[PDB]
Amino acid sequence: QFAKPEDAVKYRQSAGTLMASHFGRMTPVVKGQAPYDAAQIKANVEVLKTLSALPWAAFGPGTEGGDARPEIWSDAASFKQKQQAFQDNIVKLSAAADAGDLDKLRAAFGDVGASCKACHDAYRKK
Amino acid sequence: QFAKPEDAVKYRQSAGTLMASHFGRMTPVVKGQAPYDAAQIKANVEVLKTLSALPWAAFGPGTEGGDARPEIWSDAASFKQKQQAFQDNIVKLSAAADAGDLDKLRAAFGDVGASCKACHDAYRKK
Ligand code: HEC
Ligand code: HEC
Asked: Does A38 contact B at CB distance below 8 Å?
């Protein structure tokens, strides 16, 4: 769907921006600094679920640029393992949110955050 | 969810970027220049549905900036009518996509595009 590689870069960066907001806005809830409303979090995690499927198709052939490392493309199976494992972590977060289980939500939130960081550490330029 | 107004601006602009990609990528399909796969379009319109609910909460009190006009805030009911009507247009597009009805999809796509443009014309700086 991208006319030029720059359009793929713009897309995936914007997807990252929105994920960071929908993930990070739950930090005060996880920490107990903001109240836990199960329905609010369930709805927010649904949005995050949708968003977290979006970046990967915007690292398609010929879309090199931005702060994306070339090893994303030269090690395609490995990058794919990381995005699939991340999306698995999001499924765990969705299950916790859908159950209304705050302890499960805390734990799953931490594992999602670790998955974001692990990919950025390997595949995003500093 | 925004620490500063600049964070709300960044969010709503990124939501616009993603909407433009998920809407605009269907232009060749509507025109018949690309094939129509009902399931592919149904899934894409679902993504667009989710995205098209997102900008409005990022024009909250104190979030003035970017290319957003002040009348967004001073005429709150009117701006709200436009975003609600736009989301209604997206419901029509979803119904067309879910039905697998290409004629309905063409018509609904045009009405969605007109709704994007009408809001930008009134509320986005040139
Ligand atoms: C690899 C499997 C990733 C996972 C998991 C997550 N992110 Fe990511 N992100 C990744 C790359 C390779 C890039 C660079 C894209 C480019 O071309 O520049 C990014 C970028 C971001 C950004 C910055 C966007 C920008 O302003 O330029 C953000 C804010 C971001 N990513 C957030 C984010 C979050 C919150 C994640 C987990 C919920 C997450 N990413 C996972 C690769 C990967
Ligand atoms: C009002 C009810 C709007 C409707 C309907 C749509 N958009 Fe919009 N959009 C609106 C404003 C006020 C702004 C400016 C935001 C700011 O603070 O700068 C925008 C911006 C965009 C952008 C530009 C993002 C950027 O790169 O800075 C895009 C690409 C965009 N909008 C796309 C878009 C599409 C495709 C829409 C219909 C599917 C749509 N917008 C509707 C206000 C409104």
From this structure: no
Q: How far are the Cα atoms of A40, A70, A84, A100, A113 from residue A15, in angstroms, in the given order?
A: 21, 19, 16, 26, 16
Between B14, B21, B51, which is nearest A17 by CB?
A: B14
Q: Rounded distance, CA A89 to CA A91, Å?
A: 5
Tell whether B114 is within 8 A of chain A (Cβ). Answer: no
Instruction: Read off the DSSP letter of residue B105.
Output: H
Cβ contacts of A67 within 8 Å, gap of 6 or more: A124, A125
Distance CA B46, CA B50 (A): 6
Atom of ligand 1 nearest to the CA of A20: 35
Instruction: From the options 1.20.120.10, 2.60.120.10, 3.20.70.20, 1.10.10.10, give the CATH code of B2-126.
Output: 1.20.120.10
**The two three-digit tokens of residue A37, written as one number:** 């409303």
If DSSP codes are grouped into helix, strand and coil, which group holds residue B124? strand
Structural method: X-ray
A86: which residues sit within 8 A by CB, 6+ positions away?
A52, A112, A115, A116, A119
- Enter the tokens of residue B21: 């990609």
* Cβ–Cβ < 8 Å for A41, A96: no
Annotated resolution, angstroms: 0.9
- How many Å apart are CA A35 and CA A40, to the nearest integer? 10
Beta carbons of B126 and B81 less than 8 angstroms apart: no
Which position has the token pair 């955050």?
A113
CA B62 to CA A4: how far, in whole Å? 36
